[PDB]
Every structure is written in structure tokens, then in C-alpha cells.
Amino acid sequence: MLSPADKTNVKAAWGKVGAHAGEYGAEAFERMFLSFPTTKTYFPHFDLSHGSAQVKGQGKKVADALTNAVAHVDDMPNALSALSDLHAHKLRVDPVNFKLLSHCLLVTLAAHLPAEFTPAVHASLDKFLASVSTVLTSKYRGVLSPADKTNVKAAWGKVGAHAGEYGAEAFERMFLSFPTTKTYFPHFDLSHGSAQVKGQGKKVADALTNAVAHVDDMPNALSALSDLHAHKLRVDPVNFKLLSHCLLVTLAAHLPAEFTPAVHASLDKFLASVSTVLTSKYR
């Protein structure tokens, strides 16, 4: 979330960018294609050689769009509306790639703005490009529809008194599948059957039950949990995706009749929204 001082820092740097934004945009794509060659799969129709008119034009278009976003930083979803539609329905770039371009744009700005690229401005620019990325990927699936909310309530209703037991199973599945997540629990017994893991699973399932109950008001209902994870526990955001998968696996294994493709899709969306809320105060 862009603080007012964040907005000040971005406007500062981007002004300095000034008339070179298009050149810088092209350089960032060229850096991306070279450092992260999987990104070239989205441009097989381009001459991707150095200095190519197609790559230059791409950079200027992308630069103009970021200029638009800087100039409308307090209403980005609306300023970028057309662009969110096009990437969501037509281009369909996998979201992970936005992080790769954002890193190469940061690198480009660093290499060109020696005086301005201070630690605080770097932090602000990083947050700004993550917000842009978030807005551009926001319609790929589009936040919770009334059908999504119905599906979630129906499935979570069937979980019911088993909520805690499925939360403990989800953690155990996560620890065995993705051993790096164990680094957050060095003080627990992680063996199968562990009461500490059972207790953790219960707390998490209980919070989720609270989220389904307040599905139209999740940021307030989880505000204290958002604070806890961001300033105390400080779990790296990538791990929320790993637990969400393991929760989905757990539900599938216990709910053979209810876990339809449509319900699977709505649950994945719901857990991603929960994850978003829990990491929203990190920076």
C-alpha cells in the first residue's frame, strides 16, 4: 500500500526519468529477455535483437503507461483499466513474469539514477511496481463473485467441526512437501501427531472460519492477524501460497463430492484473497 511519502518518492524519481522513459523501458525489456529467457515465450512474433524497433516501441508503450500510473497514483485501478483488461483476457501473461520485469526496471533505474536511487526511494519504487503488477493482474480471475462466495460457504460448511483437524493435516502436508516452511517453527515438535501442530492447525482453521463468516469484510476481521504476521512473525509471503495449496489438497482428500472444478476454483481464489489480506501490512 502506497504511503503518501511513497508517492512523493516515485514522482521524484519518475520526473528525473523524464524524457528518457521510453529508452529506459526498452532497456528494461532487453535486460529481462537476457536475464530471464523464459519471458521471451510471450514475444515469439518480435525481432528480439538489440535495438529492434519492436522492442523500442514496446518500451515506450510500457513507459507511457507507468507515467499514467505515476500521474494517477491514487486511482491506479481506474487509470490502468484498459490495460488490466488486455493482459487478463488477451495477452494472458503468467503473473510471475511481472515480478521479473519489475526487477529489471529497478535495475535500469539504478543504473541511470545514481543521485536519486537512495534506499528509501528504492523501497518506494519496488512497492509502486508491485502495486502496478497487482492492478494489471487483478482481472485474471477477478476477486470473489457471489457464486464464488456461495461455493466457499457451502464447502466450508461441510468441513464444519472437522475444520481444526484439516488445518493440522494441511500444516503436516506442508512441512513434509515444502521443508523450508519448517524454518518458522524451530521451537515445535513437528512429528506426526504433534499437539503443537494440532494447536496451530486449529487456530488457522478458526481464523479461516472467521474469514468465511466475514467474507465481504475480510481486512477488518483479519486486521489483528495481518499485524501479527507483518511485524512479529514476519513469514515470507511466498509461503502463503504453499499452505494454500496444501489446504486445497487436504480438502480434496476429505470432500470427494464437494470438491468440483468450480468449487476448487472458488476456493483457490478465496485462499489467495486471504493471503493478500494477511500480507497487506508487510511494507
Partner: protein, 146 residues
Amino acid sequence: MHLTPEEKSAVTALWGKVNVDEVGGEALGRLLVVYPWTQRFFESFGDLSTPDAVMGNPKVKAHGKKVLGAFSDGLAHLDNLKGTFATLSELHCDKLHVDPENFRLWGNVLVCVLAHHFGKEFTPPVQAAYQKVVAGVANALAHKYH
């Protein structure tokens, strides 16, 4: 790919029960439903507008079976996934232009489908071994990308 005896045993035992036709189409269909941007590679497959259209789309079912068929063969050569998938790796990069991140999403959907189909028999240690394998296969398919 190195698996422990315990892990390789779990993988092979469960795989003998898998109907490659049914599971394969299920996994590709759910990928297209849950992550709809993956539909960008299948424009010529017909109607994929609703979960029901997707799941019952026969071209989806046919392609799904083919994909899982090639995965199945890879289970035979767990010691050399790279060499086994080299030609398909080059294919997916040079001709099909598929972002390797899709292989990871497909792997995770497959694990979801296995849990759904097998229930309590798909235990935590069994999932863990399958997660290793799908990660191995995805890295193998991404190996020849340039």
C-alpha cells in the same frame, strides 16, 4: 532425481492404480478452469467458457491423456528426467512457446486431482513424494529453454 526407497515405493505403488485417461483429462481440465490464463495455448480446442464446457471438452480430454501419458513414461526413468524430456523440452520452447511456469501449475493441479480421486490413501508422505516428482518433471521440461 534421487528419491528415497520409501518415496519411490509410494509413487510407483499409487501409479499402478491410476487410469491415465481419466486422471489426465481431469488434471488438464482443472488447470484451464482454475487458472484460465492457461487457456491461451488452446484457442483451437473449442468452447472453454464454463467449467462444464471445459471438463467435457473432448479435445481437452484427449490432450490431457497425452500429457499424462508422457509423464507416465517419465516415471520409468526417474534417474534421468533431464535426458528423458530433452526433446519435449525443446519442443515446448522452440515451437510451442510455453512459459515453463505452466508446468508447475499443472503439477500442483495434478496433485490436487490425485488427492481427490484417492482420498485418505493419498497421505502426507505420499503427497510429498509426488511433489518432488512433479517439481523434477517441470524442471526437466524447462531445461532446454533458451
